[PDB]
């Protein structure tokens with residue numbers, strides 16, 4: 212299974228700068244393009260080596276559609292001010308997410324097209340790709356507008372067609388990177404926190420993709436256990452750890468379980484001085 | 485307007501070994517709005533050459549950024565990350581724990 | 584590929 | 592570098608008010624102001640503005656190309672780099688030009704329209720301004736011809752972000768910062784991409800109908816003018832407006848529109864001949 216996603220952010224910041232639009236494109240957990248309206252390029256830029264072979268027609272076409280989005284979503288900040296009767300003086304955020312998922316065979320599974328205004332769900336294309344979820348009263352107006360423009364039919368055709376066909380092309384062009392699986396490299400650390408208790412920490416490092424399960428068990432039963440959010444190492448791989456506090460002398464009772472696309476069999480880790 | 489304070493993690497790209505070049509990371513996530521100010525500190529002083537990822541967000545609309553710089557860890561120097569945000573009255577400082 | 588986008 | 596911004600607008604009438612703000616290092620800090628290339632020479636004898644600089648009675652002497660420097664105490668120089676330039680343009684110094692849309696103010700989505708600014712006054716340059724926009728006015732040279740001065744602003748391809756109220760201004764060869772009084776406003780309306788209504792004779796009135804929830808319908812004849820009616824729901828989940836036929840013309844077209852989007856109309860209905 213694989214996924215493609217575009218994340219765009221438009222912010223107004225009256226008195227602190229001109230409204231700014233930033234869009235980023237991902238294939239799974241790998242960023243590959245970006246556009247920043249605050250740059251002198253004003254072009255869509257490559258951000259991963261495997262997309263840089265695409266020809267000038269690709270970069271011309273993509274820059275055109277994303278600059279258009281830049282202008283559209285910057286105007287959407289002024290419209291939202293009217294819909295919600297908000298001051299020209301306030302700072303506001305408008306976010307969009309778009310993309311599709313494909314299976315192993317290379318076929319469509321799900322599509323997405325969603326907005327938020329100031330951090331809260333605004334309008335979203337529903338799961339069936341035919342109707343819209345409006346979160347409040349302002350978004351009901353946009354819904355009524357987009358029904359009148361038949362937006363759901365166009366995005367549905369794009370998400371099931373061009374989006375999926377593009378993901379399929381990207382996955383082959385960057386196969387060795389995008390279809391790689393780097394298994395987790397694991398280690399455990401023991402730190403005493405008191406006379407009667409110690410902290411056991413299971414470490415997962417160097418893993419791609421970033422989907423992972425780190426679980427702790429005593430004698431076999433699940434022990435829900437501190438769990439940090441998976442974080443980027445900065446080289447394309449990811450890190451995570453899970454920690455539990457254990458009674459002194461019972462460390463052998465606890466085991467850490469690792470599940471990852473890169474491990475043919477689930478790992479079982481056990482402390483050992 | 486929804487305001488969410490950032491989670492901060494400070495860590496190295498690779499396992500720390502004194503004297504060996506590495507990367508110091510400050511990963512900030514879960515925050516809203518997007519305006520955030522992030523610095524990497526060496527013995528309390530901001531490190532000048534610091535790069536950062538393009539602004540992106542999660543399914544829940546929360547933003548995340550990775551800040552990083554090239555560094556060589558030592559036994560003497562103490563690294564940290566300083567984050568400011570509309571949710572924080574003063575900057576929050578998270579120390580790198582090599583332990 | 585980048586999508587076509589519409590006004591609010 | 593700081594961010595300099597004029598509020599409410601860098602285009603300001605004589606007697607209006609504009610405030611220059613200098614955002615440096617996360618606050619509107621103490622800053623000095625600089626004009627033209629004199630960026631190492633602060634204006635008004637080095638005054639340290641404390642919050643903002645409000646020029647409440649705007650005069651033509653206020654016009655110019657400004658930069659600010661925010662105070663930076665733990666710096667070798669104590670001050671920031673030069674900010675972005677902001678050009679304050681003062682209006683009301685000549686008599687207003689005229690502004691006209693070619694071929695007309697209804698512009699189909701994806702097409703272009705020409706906003707021609709003109710005057711019997713021999714203006715050297717023209718400035719086109721979309722109301723409410725922070726961006727600098729578009730500037731064009733005034734083409735002199737048969738005793739009229741004129742300039743053609745091209746707007747397009749038409750989308751909702753370009754619809755709205757436009758005004759244009761003139762300036763003389765020796766007073767570019769000094770602008771004319773603004774021309775009468777021109778409303779540019781984009782049609783589509785919302786689906787066209789149906790226009791028909793009542794099986795007498797002319798009916799505009801759509802499944803789409805347009806809240807207002809607009810009727811237009813080929814000659815020109817504009818009649819508006821609120822949409823009413825009835826007869827099978829259709830939003831429709833019935834326009835009284837009247838008790839001698841033909842070829843009418845209808846558009847739908849929504850509230851809080853005054854300058855965005857649907858594609859026109861097919862033309863209907865009324866005998």
Ligand SMILES: *[C@@H]1O[C@H](CO)[C@@H](O)[C@H](O)[C@H]1NC(C)=O
Nearest residue numbers: 598599608609610645646647
């Ligand atoms: C600036 O001062 C003038 C005159 O007192 C006033 O009309 C205007 O509202 C002020 N504007 C700002 C932004 O302070």
Ligand SMILES: *[C@@H]1O[C@H](CO)[C@@H](O)[C@H](O)[C@H]1NC(C)=O
Nearest residue numbers: 693705707733734741742743
């Ligand atoms: C502007 O467009 C009109 C209409 O095509 C044309 O006649 C005119 O020469 C153009 N230029 C100026 C300066 O008006």
